[PDB]
Amino acid sequence: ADQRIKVAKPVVEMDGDEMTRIIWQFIKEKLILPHVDVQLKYFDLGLPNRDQTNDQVTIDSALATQKYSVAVKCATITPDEARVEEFKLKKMWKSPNGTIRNILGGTVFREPIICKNIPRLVPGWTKPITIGRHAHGDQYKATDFVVDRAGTFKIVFTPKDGSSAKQWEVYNFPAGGVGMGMYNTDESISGFAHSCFQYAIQKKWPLYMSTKNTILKAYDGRFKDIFQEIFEKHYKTDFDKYKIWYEHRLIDDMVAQVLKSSGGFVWACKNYDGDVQSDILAQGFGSLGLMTSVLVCPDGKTIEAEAAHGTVTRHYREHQKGRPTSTNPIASIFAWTRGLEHRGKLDGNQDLIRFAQTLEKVCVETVESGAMTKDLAGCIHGLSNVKLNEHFLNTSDFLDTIKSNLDRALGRQ
Amino acid sequence: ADQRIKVAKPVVEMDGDEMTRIIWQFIKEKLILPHVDVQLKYFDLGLPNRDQTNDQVTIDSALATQKYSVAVKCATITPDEARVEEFKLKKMWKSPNGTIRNILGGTVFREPIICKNIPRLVPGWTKPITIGRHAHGDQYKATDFVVDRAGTFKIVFTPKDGSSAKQWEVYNFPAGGVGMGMYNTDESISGFAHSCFQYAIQKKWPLYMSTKNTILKAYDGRFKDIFQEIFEKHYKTDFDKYKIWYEHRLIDDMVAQVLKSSGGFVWACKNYDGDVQSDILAQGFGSLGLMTSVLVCPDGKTIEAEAAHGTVTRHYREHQKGRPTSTNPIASIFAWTRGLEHRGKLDGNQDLIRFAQTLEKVCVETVESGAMTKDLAGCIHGLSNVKLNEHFLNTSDFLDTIKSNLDRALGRQ
Ligand SMILES: [Mn+2]
Ligand SMILES: [Mn+2]
């Protein structure tokens, strides 16, 4: 090789679990470190270390991200009963993503990584679609509980200024059941709106925001009102100028509209809807492994790029048996590239920016050239008609191919 | 002569709004009344009458349904700010569907009405999919509010038996925002589970139930636990016997799995998810107008069949100008057939059951023969390449074709 790109500021690195943790290291050693001299503020968010630090490492990584402005995160495990037993956890630690997002705040933008040779499950989507998932509140910062006997469920709001408090009787349970309370803030919703309007303008695409305000008149109505107010005051002039538009839509009408569309728009989703619908989008364009996920804070300075899929336990078990696997690392690679690209933009480091964009292009070109992992090969020839080294490559070999293609792309620059 | 089929018990009829209200009457006059002598317990749920009765007519229709066991419902308008002004409403009346479902309870089963010549937007779904939407609680019976200043949001649960009350601080608002509380009951969830397991066995199909219990551990965990408990105690023996299975899945994993599947399964959805995902299914199979929606109550005797799509305001405006339209009446027709079929099953009226099933088959055969409304014609030739009487027919003419085909079919019997 030659000189490695010098990076003036550090990048926060959040290590993850199982198979994703394994390929994360492969990516670091084969594609990043050899070409980039970056200081990494390492935080092991692997389940074992979270348990050892009583989940404090998760909070620490979020604070570090605020300080340094950029973080790249590896997929992690959100503990359930079985995981508690498997890892002998002292507590069923809450979702680290939820914790990080709550601290940083913002919008998680998700878009498909388009490869011309990968078949879409929804033929009609000829253009990409971007989802802006509000990353704060609602079901992810809720208080839920089980009721085991008849009783009254009420809510009390007590003003800090000392003004008259208010109460609501949510329900008088005749017997057992469940209850929950959730919230969101005008401040968080506003930041969410601004980020989405700005993204739509950058893309020169229309923007749609979905809710079910016909049912949750106050809660969802707030989202609708704030979006419209912010639109009229700050973005309508530009939207009209660029011949795009902004429209609120009821969630059920919206999902049908999207499925029947040809894509080419930004879709602002509440936290829960963003979670559910982004997986429909990823799968619809071809694969869950072909999607980027970047948390953009309202400050327009801080971001957290992540691999938003599972930890591929199946493959991990094989890896533990000393066997190679064919795990798609593309999503993890884009977490690194989006992070390095932002680091470069903040520092005005053109070489780093060019490196990140080059690696992303090389990933797509590599797949389009026919080199890919088993999952993608299956999407083309059928999950039951693909043979190793014939239709797909194992993770390590796939990465070596990317590395080769990368050097070539950089050499011709 | 009067050869109408005699019906011994009444059927509750819930009239609706705008264009659906118009075609509802066409259906009654052209397809139902000429062939069936049924006593209809009429309730006008049109927005104007709901306003006139302070929405009491909605409750009255639900009580009638409990009494007579069968209701057929026309699509209605759920009032928003614009509707309040348009209809000069004294109040923004809540969703009548939510009101009826809360009173009756149960599961809303939704399935596509498959026509061989209508293209799917999701090619992979070679077999139908049925969604069992829990019809009670959650967001549809929630208490939501806007917070306009700093203050504490807390929840208090006070047991009736005098045992220790419980309190939770949901959030301390630093400024303005929104808050809400929602609930569900063990009883309602259990009825929902039973209906879905029974439906899967009737279909000889696997059953999947989705939640996000990794986040809402108590609330969603309750659904997961109750389903598993009921499965093991009442249905595992039959599922094993018929080689089918029951599995819980996280909602985001589930939607991706569904999109990539070939269909052929029952999907139990929480109220909200059922609402959103049923529109994706309807659109995915071809059209929002090609879907049945039947509320099956916990008592295993009461049902409410409805046309679950919009009121087609656009076409209604044209109708008001004395102009004919090409509005798809199939969903509304199936509301009547599913209702009459159940009436027949309860009364042991074979002729009525045969009539209902014959009419459903005739509708499908008619569309497959090439006779259809503009929306379906567009799905085949393209919304911008269809000509009246060439590729599609206006509503009245389409209904006349169905009537003609129906008589021919009933005659062969
Ligand atoms: Mn997700
Ligand atoms: Mn709906």
Swiss-Prot record, chains A, B:
Acetylation at Lys-374 dramatically reduces catalytic activity. Deacetylated by SIRT3. Binds 1 Mg(2+) or Mn(2+) ion per subunit. D-threo-isocitrate binds at T78, S95, P96, N97, G98, T99, I100, R101, R110, R133. Its EC number is 1.1.1.42. The modification N6-succinyllysine is found at K41, K67, K127, K141, K154, K217, K243, K345. Keywords: Acetylation, Glyoxylate bypass, Magnesium, Manganese, Metal-binding, Mitochondrion, NADP, Oxidoreductase, Transit peptide, Tricarboxylic acid cycle. It is an enzyme of class 1 (oxidoreductase). Its main location: mitochondrion. InterPro entries: IsoCit/isopropylmalate_DH_CS, Isocitrate_DH_NADP, IsoPropMal-DH-like_dom. GO terms for molecular function: isocitrate dehydrogenase (NADP+) activity; magnesium ion binding; NAD binding. NADP(+) binds at T76, I77, T78, R83, K260, G310, T311, V312, T313, R314, H315, N328. GO terms for cellular component: mitochondrion. SMART domains: Iso_dh. The keyword Phosphoprotein does not apply. Its cofactor is Mg(2+); Mn(2+). The modification N6-acetyllysine is found at residues 6, 9, 28, 30, 41, 67, 116, 127, 141, 154, 160, 217, 224, 233, 236, 241, 243, 345, 361, 374, 403. One of its GO terms (biological process) is 2-oxoglutarate metabolic process. Mn(2+) binds at D252, D275. It is found in: Mitochondrion. The record marks Y140, K212 as: Critical for catalysis. It catalyses: D-threo-isocitrate + NADP(+) = 2-oxoglutarate + CO2 + NADPH. Belongs to the isocitrate and isopropylmalate dehydrogenases family. Plays a role in intermediary metabolism and energy production. It may tightly associate or interact with the pyruvate dehydrogenase complex. This is Isocitrate dehydrogenase [NADP], mitochondrial. It comes from Sus scrofa.
